[PDB]
Every structure is written in structure tokens, then in C-alpha cells.
Chains A and B, each alone.
Chain A
């Protein structure tokens, strides 16, 4: 089942700035214009996040990039993917990522979200490729090379089936998917957010409060994660199982959290519209000292 991916151009790692992002709802408490101050794990403003490209330029030039390394998991990670089509379809969480321990698998196989906690044998390059045929011409999802076996399953969750728009559109990015993972007391907290955007340069700048999505009681330890991407297998790109691939219009950003002090602001309905990082500059220090945005 495990198939490698050769013919890939290497490049130095790129870094961008997350201006004001990663702010989520710390607790399920309704607040109407109270300007609450919380002490929890958040993403620092104007931080230094990593940029992973996935492009493919025609001809014997350009870059053939398909990056999905095993990144560390230090107190939680911030996952933001500027997607043009359905390419990022899940992640892999765990410590050993082998049959020695357990691992969390939250993947989308073009049917729905599949959440399983078993002892898998994850490959060195897992992916869920698509297939574009000429007869019955429709982008279909016939590929599954994430793991080899699954024994001693503890937790499982598969919701109702659903279709998937595997259309490989060409142009600019259309939507943004932000995710904040955290595991502090056995419960795996996930904060998701959806925001349309049409930029093709970097991470969008603004503010969006991520809402809690699922609270999965797993109890397993998480020290290093990995992102699962997709591949395109069609004509004009011949090759073997480990070649003849193509991709593009895919990128995801990873930011690590740390204990900080934030002054969240709620509106008259309960949504977070603005926040300040107290440990950024003396201006925000004074703002958090007097607990107001008017200085």
C-alpha cells in the first residue's frame, strides 16, 4: 500500500507572518460587550509561521513541490489552508505513528469525515489522490495509501455520507479553512472556521474567531502531526505508481501556540470581533492594564 513519491523539487523553507489570526473561543460562555480577558493558549500576533507550497509548472523548469513533513506538536498547532479545490483532506496525529502506539486519523475520503483512533502503520508519504478519466469523464476519488493495517481500534466516528466537489478549477483561491488543534486534558479540541478569499500571494490579513467544532475524548498523547494532501492522476503525465503525478493550487500554514494573555472583545450578540496580544508591545501592555481599546 505504501508508495513513495519521487521526482520532487526541493526548496528552502519559506516563512510568512500571521498578522492577527488563531483567536478562538476559549470557553462556551456567552458575553455581550464585556471585553473579557483570558489566560490560555493562543497564537501570538504577527508571529512566524511556516509556508508549504504545492505547485507544478509545465515544461522542464519551474517547481514540482509536494510537502507534507512530520511537523512537531508543541501545545497545539494552527492549521490554515488556502485551497482552490479539495486537496487538503485530513491530518495525522500521534507520537510514534506506527504499531507501537495509537494515532488519531481524521481524514476525508470524498465521502465524509472519518475519525478513527487505532494503531496504524503510516507510510513515509501518505496521500489520497484523485482520478480524472476520459470515459465517464468526472473527477473521482479512487486512491487510499495512508496506512497499511488498522488493529486495536478504540474510537471511531463516521458521519453521514456526502458528495465531494473534486473539480480542479484553475485561477485564484476561493476559500480559507482555519483549524486550531489542542489536547490538554485528553479531550481533542478542534476549532474550525470558513472564510472566502481571493488572493494568490500569502495568508489573508484580518480577523476571524474560530468556533469549536468537535471535542473528541481520546486521551492519547500527541507530539508530532502530519498533513494529508491529494494527487491528480490523469493523461499527459505518464509514470509508475511513484511517478506520473501532478498537483497545484495548494498551500497550508502551520503556527504553534504558546501560553499568552489576550483581551478578547465581544459584540452585542456574542461574536469575537477584535483582540490584542498583551505581550507584543508596551502599547498593548497598557491596553491590557487599563482593559480598554481607547488609549
Chain B
């Protein structure tokens, strides 16, 4: 006869009634993804509509229960996750126009149009096109042409659409008892009602800034090295004091610097550790890949895969008889059925993606012992970092030679180590300043520190000060440069990748010092160590039942987001970069617009 008991009864009823509906929706989505037909999409849409209607119906009944008369933390968290109004505190016309704007921006981004001049054809879509033109080409002219065409044709076309989107999102966020939409996006890292472990929502900005201030030296050295190696490839196009151009970063937006490894490789005569040809020389297939992944996971302490996992997963492309999306995904249906959708080839990248997806599945099976509203990761960065640390620990030469791929007589030269560290740097640290700049720009454009004008001006001034990127063509206040990405054109958060990057190295160091491993961190294998397995399982059980700070303290021993593990990981490369940049200029300067 109290609010707590009524809330617990309602929560039990909801947890019982929502599991079957979510399982049916997930089953329909699986049948669609594994079989692209006109009937499966209809069933998927029907199941999605039913689940959305059920979730919206179980939101006004839960809205009647107040949150200030509850002493149990689990019930409070479940109700706070359930009483989320979201897009309901608006008007009919307002919500309809917002959905229309979102859908039309998504369609404008998904369609795309190359439409080269003096050519009535060859106007390609987001399929192979500008991607490989900006990725594996060395011509300045065509790179600049593509970077200008994608930003002028699928760019400024979304300027008023994005303005109205920002206005409507700010209206929704202010009407939802919150600050600007940036606060609504940062609300995921908020922890209240716990003594000592409380994490303010505004402290995330300060933490990200303090971590970036310590990342700055490594990124400046990496930028200097990349610029020095790029001046030898693009003569009379980049100054050794200025900033790097935008269209010479091996990507349309400059997010990842993976395509610059073929140009910035220090020891071009030393081959990598690619064991792709070693697997085809013997009986290896997707089944063997996943068996080796299960063997790696069971060696740490994690349980075996479920029986349905092997008889329900689509580990191999069925061929042309039926069409299926070959994007590697880990499916959690919700009723003990865990399976992976992946067209696993006999390559090494797929061998690491298998470990990534199996780490996702292990996290899911770990937190599957909690209520439905809490069966999710602590933050939006833990779930991907759990697989990223496994992919890092499984890509080491020790594990490769222990499984049987690499020859036991293989010598571990330090040149290959420098090359691997530089590749990891280009693929990890290269996106940290970009992510930070993009997320700070989103936060300042949602809060209001940037007026309706001066969007691109301050965007480029930040991309010059924070990042080492400079625009090749002067863009006025009419172009829409930031909206050329996928996450911004579809209303997705971006700080999750930064948090995942900062958490994966902390997890690696914590699980490596627990396994009593000596030497550098980049060659540490989490294998045949049950202590690290138990330490990680103590964190994978929590999910959303406990704050993420408590999970970090339980798995690492810190209550904040530290960056020292990343520096400890990249120290062997940091010293080499310091020794190589002795006869060059470190850092970058502004006022070098290539106009």
C-alpha cells in the first residue's frame, strides 16, 4: 500500500509483457536482415509499430508514479528510463514536421549524387564512388573536386533543414525539463542519487577537455609526422608550418586516417603480420574462426556459446539464392537467444571482427540476468569497448602463434612493432580530435553560443585550432560543411566513440596488470588468465543496474575517465615520433588558408 510496491508491481508486469513483444520484433528484424523480401519487411514494420505502440502505452501509466517518493535505486532507474517523454512533449504539427525533416535529411544523405560536369551520367550514390576516390587516390585535383562536390551538392542543401532541426530539438529539450539538446545528449552519462559516485552532466565537458589537453602532445607529434610524410608525396601543396588540407586525409570527412598508412609507413620493406594467406593454406572456414573465438573467450573465464548460437547464426553468406545484409552485427533477441549476423570470409579483418562480435555477445549474456530496462551497457561506450579490447588482445603475435597461424620461429622485430603502433595510432588517435571538435560544435550550436550565422566560420576556426585541418576552398556562410557526415545527418551522438576510445585502453591496462604481464602494453594478451576474466565479469554483470563510475572502479579502480592508459600504450611510438621530429617543426599554425 505504497508507491514503492505499486511501482514494483507495475515494473514486474511491464518486464513480463515487453519481453515477448521485443523478442517478436527482434525475430522479425532477423528474418528481414537474413532474407530481403517484400513480405519480411512488412512483418518487420508491423512488429516495430506494435513495439512502439506498446512502449508509448506503457509511458503514461508509468508517468503517474512520482519519482521523488522512491527509495529503491533499481526501481527509480527503471522508471526514469521508462518515463522518458522524448518526442511526446510537442504539438501534432510540430512533431510531424520534425519527423518529416528528419526523414528528408536521411533520404538526402542516403541517395547522394555525384553528377560530374560535362557528363550526363556517372552520378553515383553512397555506393562505391567518392569513397575510393578520396581513399586510394593521390591526385590533388580530383580529390579537391570530390570534396567540393559532396559538400556543395549534398551540403548547403541541408542548411535550412538543419536549422529547423536544431530549433525543434532545442524546443523539445527545453520542454522536457532539460536544457538545450546538448544537455539531453549528455544526460546519458548522468549519475544522481548515489553518494560519492554522482556524476554531474556538465562535468563531462570538463573531463573531455582535460583528457584532450593531455592527448594534444601525441596528436601534435603524429600530425607533424603525417605532414612531413605528406610533403614528400604532395610537393608544393602543404607547408611544413601550416595545417593539413581537408581532402588529403584519406577520407571525405577526415574521420579515420587509415588510408594514410600506405604513404606514412616508416619501414616500407618490413611486412606486417597479415596471416590471411596462412589460413587459406589449411582447412579454415567461418566455423573454425568462431570456434577459435570461443576457445579464446573460454580461456579467460567466460562461458561457452549457447546451443542456439551455432544452429541459428548465419556465419556464412548464403549466396545469390537469397539476399542478406553482410554488415557484422550481434543480435540480442531478449529470451536467451544470442546469434551473430556476419558474412565471415577467410581474411584476418573478419577474424578480429568475429572476436569483436563475440565480445558483444558475451556482454549481452552477462547482463541478461537483469530486468529488461537494465539489460544494456552502462554507457554508450562500454558495449563497443568490450569487443574492441578483445580485438586488440587477439591481434597480437603471441596469440597468433599460440593458435597456430603464425610460425613459432617468427622473430618479433621492433620495426614491425613501430608499424603496427603507427597503424593503431592512425586508426584510433586520428579520430579523437575530430570527434571532440564535432561534438563541441554540436554542443555549442545547440546551447546557443554560436548564433544562426557564423556556423561554418567558427567550425573552420575550431578545425584549424583544435584539429590540424584547413579547408582548401573558402566556404561562405551558405554552405553546410558539418552536415556532410552520417551521424549528424541522422541525429546520432558522437562522443560515444571518444568515450569508447578512452575506456578501451583503461580496460586493457587493468586486465593486463591483473594477469601479471611484463613488458609493453601493446603486446599484452588476455589469455589463459582467469583473474582478469573474473575482474571483467564483475563489471559485465552490472549493466545499467549500477552507475558507470562504480563499474569503472570495479574493473579498473578509478571513478573518472583517465587518459594515462592511452599514453602508456603509445609511448613506444611517442618516443620514436619525438626522435624523428627532431629536424622538423612540431605543431601547426593558423593563417595559412590555401586560397
Do the two chains touch directly in the complex (Cβ atoms below 8 Å apart)? Answer: no
Q: Which residues of A contact B (CB under 8 A)?
A: none
